[PDB]
Design a protein around this nucleic acid. Structure first.
Ligand SMILES: [Zn+2]
Ligand SMILES: [Zn+2]
Length: 688
RNA sequence: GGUAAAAUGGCUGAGUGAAGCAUUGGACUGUAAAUCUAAAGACAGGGGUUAGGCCUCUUUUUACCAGC
């Protein structure tokens, strides 16, 4: 077969603060993703990009925002059933993959291949990929540029020209003739030499593109001195059609970098990916939040997404900003396409909401009907399960007990993007008030994103000049193993975390080391809390919950994912609010016990038997992520948890009226789940 | 919400072009059932390479989504 005739270069991530720059290559035979940062999988799912079917993943910098989402992509590939997958990047990649198996489990069902930089190159029928290691003058100092060249595209045959004279067009005899013409062998027939030039166009050797990342000025000189780039610079046998620079704005304005890259020539297109992007990625989440805000303000606050404040400076050659969903076309025609750019238009969402069936009447009735502690802020950053999707992110909740103190509690993959989308530009101040973080259990979706929040908190603290206060993390002994396995070859950031085992915090437990001594004290008398206790749950090995009591006598208990635990009862008694799991729903008791989930019915049961004033669910299943069915058991002490939800103690006599409008908003989706899940599960149970 | 499999007609086998069973007037047959010399409906809805077969966007049908 001939060379590919449809190659597209697209960006899934614009290199924003939330997530690092990510590329995407679409070809008729193979697909590539290059850098796999945090949240790139969710963006690909949102943009309809096929998560599976990926052939190669190329890593450049080996940095968390560039490799944080690799675990999620690997898990998704494993679930999808992809048989083969190849990973390439720095030679120490295999070490990172090994640490993943500690908590992610064996990678059965999918074959993973690690290609170190020592390998010469990787061949393909669609294009060839090289690798030129780069070393800085100042291991996190190693970056790699790939440089990709396409294959020969055979010229099309002039069928009309051949038919004009009387060649056997439309018959099997034409196949050898066209095969010989395309190959390059002259064909003589009918007593004359037709020659290939009169039957086909000259062959096209194909273009090429270069991917290079310059984290800082330190890498400018090594890049300039690179010998390989010299051959492709200026005139060359394979002109480079496009080059992408994943470098900060300051580095781009550097005179040396501009002079070196200017040798590429005027025909070379340049693309820059950095924090200066001006595109919005998640339209569905923004629409959902805007629609929810129309019901009750101050409980679903507007995202107030950050926006660029400085226009890109003029340079020697015009530049095209990274943006989102920007695609560059190769092979058929070299041009830029912008027919799929994402823009935020809240007016359309408002108009669509105004046309909802009877939603306006319900909202008006609720408003007509509507018409204590002031800062017990509780915000649910995420409420979904593992494998985050567009509608919601993995479970993650934060509480702002005091303006100067806060508790992160569970923190899943990333969640700094969620924090930025929630508080906007105010995250910098908020991130500096973080006091401690607690992980639920060994599952990756609850503790995989810790490095990102750690780095972001460190950056925020350094921005204001405040000294460095080590963060307190309450995780089992399993987490420390992963942390020590990591950071030994990439970052060495062990100074930003202090471990406090949860076993010593268990009710009736005893301190087993002086390290916890004065450490529990530092944790206390700082969050306005009186004693902190934990206990095991019936979920899996090394699973613990947390109970927090304020100095004023307000008590809140968080359990997480587990079966109804009798030990939890009699310990969280008189708790103002409680947090449980509602992964599954009624009618799936067999799956609930098999999957080790309480389910909504058992959670509500313990809720009435727990005496807690308020019962709040969490960790909604992906099958009912849009909204869980409101069972008749709902009472004044229950509620519904949603992403970016904000609830105060004074809202207790206010939320009951929200059920009608919330159920009205989700009509089509609720009908879909009712028609799909309940009947199917009932039929399956009856058959079995 | 995601993954796997098939979209051809009254039914059904594939990709040189379309192949097998069923019926319209009936001949052997007083009798309308035996064996045909003609008949027909024809590859779900787009588009990229020019070609069917290849890849992508929707629509309809079956199955699956579990404790680390
Ligand atoms: Zn879990
Ligand atoms: Zn969980």
């Amino acid at each position: 077969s001939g060379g590919p005739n449809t190659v597209y270069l697209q960006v899934v991530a614009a290199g924003s603060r939330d997530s690092g720059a990510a590329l995407y290559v679409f070809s008729e035979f193979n697909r590539y993703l290059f850098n796999c940062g945090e949240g790139v999988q969710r963006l690909m799912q949102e943009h309809k990009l096929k998560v599976a079917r990926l052939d190669n993943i190329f890593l450049t910098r080996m940095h968390w925002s560039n490799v944080g989402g690799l675990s999620g992509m690997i898990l998704t590939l494993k679930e999808t059933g992809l048989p083969k997958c190849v990973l390439s990047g720095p030679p120490q990649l295999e070490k990172y993959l090994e640490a993943i198996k500690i908590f992610s489990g064996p990678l059965k069902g999918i074959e993973l291949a690690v290609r170190p930089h020592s390998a010469p190159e990787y061949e393909d029928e669609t294009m060839t990929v090289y690798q030129i290691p780069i070393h800085s003058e100042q291991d996190s100092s190693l970056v790699v540029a790939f440089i990709c060249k396409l294959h020969l595209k055979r010229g099309n045959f002039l069928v009309l020209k051949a038919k004009e004279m009387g060649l056997p067009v439309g018959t099997a005899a034409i196949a050898p003739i066209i095969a010989a013409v395309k190959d390059g062998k002259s064909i003589t027939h009918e007593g004359r030499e037709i020659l290939a030039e009169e039957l086909c166009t000259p062959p096209d050797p194909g273009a090429a593109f270069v991917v290079v990342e310059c984290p800082d000025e330190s890498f400018i000189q090594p890049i300039c001195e690179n010998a390989t780039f010299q051959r492709y610079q200026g005139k060359a046998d394979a002109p480079v059609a496009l080059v992408v620079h994943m470098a900060p704005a300051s580095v781009l304005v550097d005179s040396r970098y501009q002079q070196w890259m200017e040798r590429f020539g005027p025909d070379t297109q340049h693309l820059v990916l950095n924090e200066n992007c001006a595109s919005v990625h998640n339209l569905r989440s923004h629409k959902i939040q805007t629609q929810l805000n129309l019901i009750h303000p101050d409980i679903f606050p507007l995202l107030t997404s950050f926006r660029c404040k400085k226009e890109g400076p003029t340079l020697s050659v015009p530049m095209v900003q990274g943006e989102c969903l920007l695609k560059y076309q190769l092979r058929p025609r070299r041009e830029w396409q912008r027919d799929a750019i994402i823009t935020c238009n809240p007016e359309e969402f408002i108009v669509e909401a105004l046309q909802l069936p009877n939603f306006q009447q319900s909202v008006q009735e609720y408003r007509r009907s509507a018409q204590r502690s002031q800062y017990p802020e509780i915000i649910f950053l995420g409420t979904g399960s593992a494998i985050p999707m567009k509608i919601r992110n993995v479970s993650a909740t934060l509480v702002n007990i005091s303006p100067d103190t806060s508790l992160l509690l569970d923190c899943g993959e990333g969640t700094f993007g969620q924090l930025c989308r929630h508080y906007g530009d105010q995250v910098d101040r908020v991130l500096g008030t973080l006091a401690a973080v607690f992980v639920s259990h060994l599952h990756a979706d609850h503790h995989t994103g810790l490095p990102s929040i750690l780095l972001q908190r460190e950056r925020a603290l350094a921005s204001l000049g405040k000294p460095l206060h080590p963060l307190l993390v309450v995780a089992p002994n399993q987490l420390k193993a992963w942390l020590q396995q990591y950071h030994n070859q990439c970052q060495e950031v062990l100074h930003h975390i202090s471990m406090i085992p949860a076993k010593c915090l268990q009710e009736g437990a005893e301190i087993s080391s002086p390290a916890v001594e004065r450490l529990i004290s530092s944790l206390l008398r700082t969050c306005d809390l009186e004693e902190f206790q934990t206990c095991l749950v019936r979920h899996c090995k090394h699973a613990f919950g947390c109970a927090l009591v304020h100095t004023s006598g307000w008590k809140v208990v968080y359990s997480g994912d587990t079966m109804p635990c009798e030990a939890l009862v009699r310990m969280g008694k008189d708790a103002t609010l409680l947090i449980h799991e509602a992964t599954l729903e009624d009618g799936l008791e067999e799956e609930a016990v098999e999957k080790t989930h309480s389910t909504t019915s058992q959670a509500i049961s313990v809720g009435m038997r727990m005496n807690a004033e308020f019962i709040m669910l969490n960790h909604f299943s992906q099958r009912y992520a849009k909204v869980p069915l409101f069972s008749p058991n709902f009472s004044e002490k229950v509620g519904v948890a949603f992403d970016h939800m904000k609830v105060c103690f004074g809202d207790f006599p206010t939320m009951p009226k929200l059920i009608p409008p919330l159920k009205a908003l989700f009509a089509g989706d609720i009908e879909e789940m009712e028609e799909r899940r309940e009947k199917r599960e009932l039929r399956q149970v009856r058959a079995a």
